[PDB]
Structures are given as C-alpha cells and as structure tokens.
C-alpha cells in the first residue's frame, strides 16, 4: 500500500460567515450563513491528488480537539494515510476565520495553531515512507525549519520535491529554491518573492526567470483564467499554457487543486512532458472553479474525461 | 425540581481569534490564539440567574452538531435544565465569529442559525415548563414571532414577563410592549426604539416614558457605569439607581448579567421593591465587569456578599 505522494504541511478548519457587508471596528453585525469546511493548503493538495487516484500520506499536526478528530476522519474519508497525522494538547487545530460579503470581498484571520508544532522529530518518524515516495509536497503554512527538513530528507532519498511558497514572504530562505525540483506559485506570490509587477503572461515569464536564477530547476507561475507559465533550467524560454475558458462558480482553492494534480502526474505519469502535465493540471483546476466550497469542489477521477489518464 | 426562571432565547458558539490588530478590508492577518466560548444573550442571562441559585430552564434550539452537543454540556455544567433544549438537522448551531485586538477592540459577526428555527411546536411542547415558572425571559436573537409567542404563553399563564429587546429593531410589534411586565434595554437600544439621544439619566427618563406609554408595566434603561433608570405604570416619575464605582476589566456581557440577576430577584424575592431589586442587580453586573470573558465573569452566590440574599430591604 506504498504512498507515492507525501504531503508535509497544514490542516486548517475553515470558519466562514457570509454577510451583506463587512463589519467596521467595534461593530457587531448579523450574517446570513455560516459553514465549516476542511482546508489548509497541505490537506487541500493531498485531497486533490488522492481523488485523482494517488496513494497519499499527510504528514501534519492537529489539536486534541473536536476540529482535530473531525480533520483525521476527513483525511480517512478521502483515502489518505493518517499514519503520521499527529495530535497535540498544546494548541488548537489551525483555523481560518473568514468573513465574506455578497460581492466576494473578505477579511481573514488565520491562527496556524497545532500546525506550527509539527517538528523535526515528528518528520524523522516518517523517514521510510518519505524514502519510498515519488513526490514530496510542501508549502509555507507550517514552521519553515520543518518544511526545510522535509525537502532535505526528500533530496537525500532522490524523491522529487514540489514546493508551493504559499503564503509567500519577501525574505524566503534561499534553501527553499535550491531544494525545489518544481517551484509553483501564483501571480501575487511571484510579486512578493521577486518585487516585480505581474500583470500578464510576459511579466510572469520575467518573474519566473528571477526564481530560476535563485536555484529552482522548474518554475511554474499560475495566472488564474490565463492558465500558467513554465520555464526550466533545460528550457529557460517561458512557455504560456492557456486553460479551459469556463464560467467560474468559486475560484477558492484552485491553486491547491492545480498543485495536487501536478503531484499526481509527477508521481504516476513521469513519462509525460511537463507541458502535457501542466495542460491536464490546468484542466483539473478549471473543473474545481466550476463548483462551490474548496475541498468539496475537487473532482474525482471517475467524473473526469478518460483522456486525462492516458498516454 | 420545578424551574422558577424559564429563558426562551439564544445559544451561540463564540469562535474567538486574538490578533495584535484588526484586519483591513481584503486583508488576511495571522492571530496568535483561537478559542471557543459560549455565548448568546438567552444562555448568558440563564447562566447568571443559575449561578445566583435559580432553578432555570433554557428553551432553545441548537444544531444536531458538535457545537450543539458542546452547548448542551455547557448548560449542564452551569446546573441549567436542558429538558427543552432542542436540536435540528436543518441548521447549524448559532455562531459568533469574534476578532479581538490587544486593546480589546473587536469585530463580531453573528449567524443566528438554529436559534431562528425554534418554533411554535417547540414552545407548545414546553407549555408545562412555561406555565409552572415564576418568570419568563426573552430577547430578540430568535425569530421575533417566537419571542412574541413565548410572551403570549407566559401572560396567558399569569407568568411574569421580562423582555430584553436586544438587539433592537426600530419598529417592534406593539404587542411586545403590551405583553411585557418588565421591559429592559441599554442606551443604544433605547435610542433605536425612541429616536432620542440616551446619554445621561435625564435623557433616559425621557426615553423610558416614551416606552412606558407604548404599554409596558415597567421600563428599565441600563446606563453602564451610571447604573439604571426605572419607571412604572404605578410610579411614572423616573428613578435613577446608581451602581458600585469599580475598576472595569471587561464590560462585555454586563447587560446579560444584569438581566439574569433581575430574573432571579423577580422569581425568588418577589416581595422586594423594584429599587431594591435594581440595586442588587446593578451590584451583580458590576462584579461581572471586574473579570474577562462574558459567561466566565458571571459571579456565583458563594462569592457574593450575604446582604444580596436577604429577604428584607437592606440599609
Ligand atoms: N477563472 C478561472 N478559469 C479557469 N481556470 C482557472 C480560473 N481560476 C483558476 N483557474 C485554474 O486554476 C489554476 C490555479 O489558480 P490561480 O492562479 O488562481 C492560484 P489561487 O488564486 O487559487 O492561489 C490556474 O493555473 C488555472 O488552471
Ligand atoms: N463600568 C461599569 N461599572 C459598574 N457597573 C457597570 C459598568 N458597566 C456596566 N455596569 C453594570 O452593568 C449594567 C448593564 O450594563 P450596560 O448598561 O453597559 C449594558 P451595555 O450597554 O454594554 O450592553 C449597568 O446597569 C451596571 O449595573
Ligand atoms: Mg485564483
Ligand atoms: Mg456597557
Ligand atoms: Na471551487
Ligand atoms: Na466581564
């Protein structure tokens, strides 16, 4: 039952209130709807890869609380290995409290909580599962020392590293670049990392070259409805890969859908060209934007065209 | 065993994030702590009355969900009867999403949820607990038609009605006034209901008289550190009842403490004058503002002065 995709990253409870307008300082307002969902970039990416057919393992930490218990059940209901899903009494399960108005404007408060207490001792326990994987995926929602050690362990075992610098910090440790076989971010993260404005595929190609020279082997910048741009040490000329023109219902977590799809193709279809993998990943992310509710929008293999699983 | 105070009203899960500052519009920030607390004006008033030694019953509706199950455990931990706490598959437990900065400034979004599905069938099933009570307390955090039905059932049963029009609506149904034995609101609610300024005891006397003439038997406007102002159909000249001068730590939920204390005295010390009941209720609410965290700040009888529980008028 070997995991081909290991995700070392975050699980977060999403707490969403829908309002007619955002509250002002000192203001109590009444919203019209509240819901809970399962989020966190690590878990979102793992759930998309699992639903495409990947054997996955989620290395993460949640609270010894109701939210933590519910999160472990969510991973098992998506056929994800929870062998190295830890729980702790020392902090609450990570939370994202989101207030959203009718026009889709928001205010968000994140408390990473238990996610931050995933430590190098917890990783070292997963050494054998990491060593037998094809792809290791990380983000920036846990403690950086933990993510850096995960990428180091992957490299030592010859496991391909897929790094998503999300959310982005302007002074990212240079080892994040040099430990990344595939570096994938969105337009706003590329602007934070490079200081360049990114308002077109051409601008994304300029930002991607900066990231390449910092030591990345492959750089992908996602561009929402414009698909993505890719370049590599072997092919440094930026290629624009356009996506399905669709009617977006809810673009929340499309980035995570795209990253989880890419992990699945890197693990299970290593013979496909990068261009082909990014075309399929674009298509899967595009399906996700045509439904509401983050993980509940992620498509399963049985509902996707057969051609996404050929060649 | 019989509940003398029946609260027909709201339970809300408080989902609290602590941050160094409140976010800007479109802004994502990191906070340093998230925790769950128990709120809702109905439950808050019930908890204060129960901690003063009242046998209470909370008529309410929560989700058939973990937040609802946890709310029922909270009520039981405060020795409240949950025999008429309903659940529903058709709505989540009410929620208050609260962001609090380091100076204690906040943003709150309330989604009433299951509280709005408390219905006429649910109240009819609670008819015996209502008819056996001394005082029925309600607010405006459930469907207002539901609060109006509870007040109607109380009045028909000769049960004293204590109505807190919170949060306030500018045009309440006229029966909210005529069915209220004791109508209790704060300065901001009085301003909404009357169209007047309510800043001082003098302003509160004018606003309280407009409310009394809509058909309330007793009107009480709370004035924070200035205590409260009362008048009644019997004694329409407003009286100003001042409160304990105290060093406030956290005034959140002081209104609910005051209303819960008042319910307690109406139920267990009916002999006392309104002025004596308000003096004691003010004192209890002032203890609550000396500690953080709404329900967790509400004092127990064992920690209060014995003089609050004398049957007779005290010096
Ligand atoms: N409006 C839209 N129409 C079609 N595809 C979309 C789309 N928004 C996003 N996608 C797809 O989802 C991928 C990732 O989306 P983003 O670049 O928006 C990352 P994020 O905004 O979720 O962080 C894109 O590369 C694209 O394939
Ligand atoms: N700073 C303070 N010092 C003493 N008592 C206070 C107080 N703030 C509130 N109280 C007590 O709590 C009662 C209800 O308080 P409020 O009138 O503040 C209700 P709110 O406007 O904050 O909802 C007051 O009548 C008084 O007895
Ligand atoms: Mg997007
Ligand atoms: Mg106050
Ligand atoms: Na979606
Ligand atoms: Na308090």
Swiss-Prot record, chain A:
Keyword Metal-binding set for record: yes
InterPro entries the UniProt entry points to: Carboh/pur_kinase_PfkB_CS (IPR002173), PfkB_dom (IPR011611), Ribo/fructo_kinase (IPR002139), Ribokinase (IPR011877), Ribokinase-like (IPR029056)
Annotated residues for binding of ATP: 186, 222-227, 243, 255-256, 282
Reactions accelerated catalytically: D-ribose + ATP = D-ribose 5-phosphate + ADP + H(+)
Keywords: ATP-binding, Carbohydrate metabolism, Cytoplasm, Kinase, Magnesium, Metal-binding, Nucleotide-binding, Nucleus, Potassium, Transferase
Residues at which K(+) binds: 250, 252, 288, 291, 293, 297
Molecular functions (GO terms): ATP binding; identical protein binding; metal ion binding; ribokinase activity
Cofactor: binding comment: Requires a divalent cation, most likely magnesium in vivo, as an electrophilic catalyst to aid phosphoryl group transfer. It is the chelate of the metal and the nucleotide that is the actual substrate.
Keyword Nucleotidyltransferase: no
Domain of life assignment: Eukaryota
PROSITE patterns per the UniProt record, alphabetical: PFKB_KINASES_2
Pathway linked to the protein: Carbohydrate metabolism; D-ribose degradation; D-ribose 5-phosphate from beta-D-ribopyranose: step 2/2
Subcellular location per the Swiss-Prot or TrEMBL entry: Cytoplasm; Nucleus
Family according to the record: Belongs to the carbohydrate kinase PfkB family. Ribokinase subfamily.
Protein name per Swiss-Prot or TrEMBL: Ribokinase
Organism annotation: Homo sapiens
Gene that encodes it: RBKS
